[PDB]
C-alpha cells in the first residue's frame, strides 16, 4: 500500500505527542486532502487535551460515531511501534507534503499551457523541481 491518511492518523493515535511535531497544516488544509480533516481533527483534539494518551484517546471518544474508525487505528498491528512511529511520521508527513507539492506542480503546469500562470509562478516551478530532485 501507500501512506494514505492511515499512517499519519494511526501513528498520532499510538503517539499523541506527535501532535506537537505536526506543522499548522498551511500547505495542506482540509481542502487539498479529502479526508485529512480526520487527522487534523485528531491532532487538534490532542492539542486540546494536554496529557491525552494512546488508550485515553479512545476513552475521550468513548461511544462516538468516530470511535469505530479510531478502534480500527488503535487495534492497528500494521505499525504497533513508538520508535519507528516518529520516523514513519516524519516520512509519511514528507510523503503527504511531496504529493501535495507534486499535485501543485501539475496544477501549475496545467495552468501554464492554457491560462498562463505568472512569471513568478513559472519560476516557483523551477525551485519546486529542485526541491523534488533531492528528497
Domain ranges of the chain: 1-135
The distance in angstroms from the start CA to the end CA of the chain is: 20
Sorted by sequence, the CB contacts under 8 Å of residue 86 that are 6+ apart come out as 15, 18, 21
CA 89 – CA 86 distance, rounded (Å): 5
**Which residues fall within 8 angstroms of residue 124, CB to CB, at 6 or more apart?**
108
> Which distant-in-sequence residues (6+ apart) come within 8 Å of 44 by Cβ?
none
Q: How far apart are the C-alpha atoms of 124 and 105, rounded to whole Å?
A: 9
Which CATH class for the 1-135 domain? mainly alpha
Q: What is the 3-state secondary structure (H, E, C) of the chain?
A: CCCHHHHHHHHHHHCHHHHCCCCCCCCCHHHHCCCHHHHHHHHHHHHHCCCCCHHHHHHHCCCCCCHHHHHHHHCCCCCCCCHHHHHHHHHHHHHHHHHHHHHHHHHHHHCCCCCCCCHHHHHHHHHHHHHHCCC
Phi, psi of 5, deg, nearest 5: -70, 15
| C-alpha closest to that of 54 among 83, 33, 75, 78 | 75
**In whole angstroms, what is the distance from residue 46 CA to residue 38 CA?**
12
Q: Give the method used.
A: NMR
Amino acid at each position: 500500500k501507500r501512506t494514505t491518511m492511515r499512517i499519519l492518523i494511526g501513528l498520532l493515535v499510538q503517539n499523541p505527542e506527535l501532535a506537537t511535531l505536526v506543522p499548522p497544516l498551511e500547505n495542506l488544509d482540509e481542502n487539498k486532502l479529502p479526508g485529512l480533516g480526520l487527522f487534523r481533527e485528531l491532532v487538534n483534539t490532542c492539542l486540546s487535551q494536554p496529557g491525552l494518551t494512546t488508550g485515553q484517546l479512545l476513552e475521550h471518544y468513548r461511544g462516538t460515531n468516530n470511535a469505530a474508525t479510531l478502534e480500527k487505528l488503535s487495534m492497528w498491528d500494521d505499525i504497533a511501534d513508538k520508535n519507528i512511529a516518529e520516523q514513519t511520521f516524519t516520512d509519511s508527513l514528507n510523503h503527504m507534503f511531496d504529493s501535495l507539492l507534486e499535485l501543485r506542480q501539475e496544477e501549475l503546469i496545467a495552468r501554464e499551457r492554457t491560462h498562463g500562470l505568472s512569471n513568478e509562478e513559472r519560476l516557483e516551478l523551477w525551485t519546486l523541481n529542485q526541491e523534488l530532485a533531492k528528497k
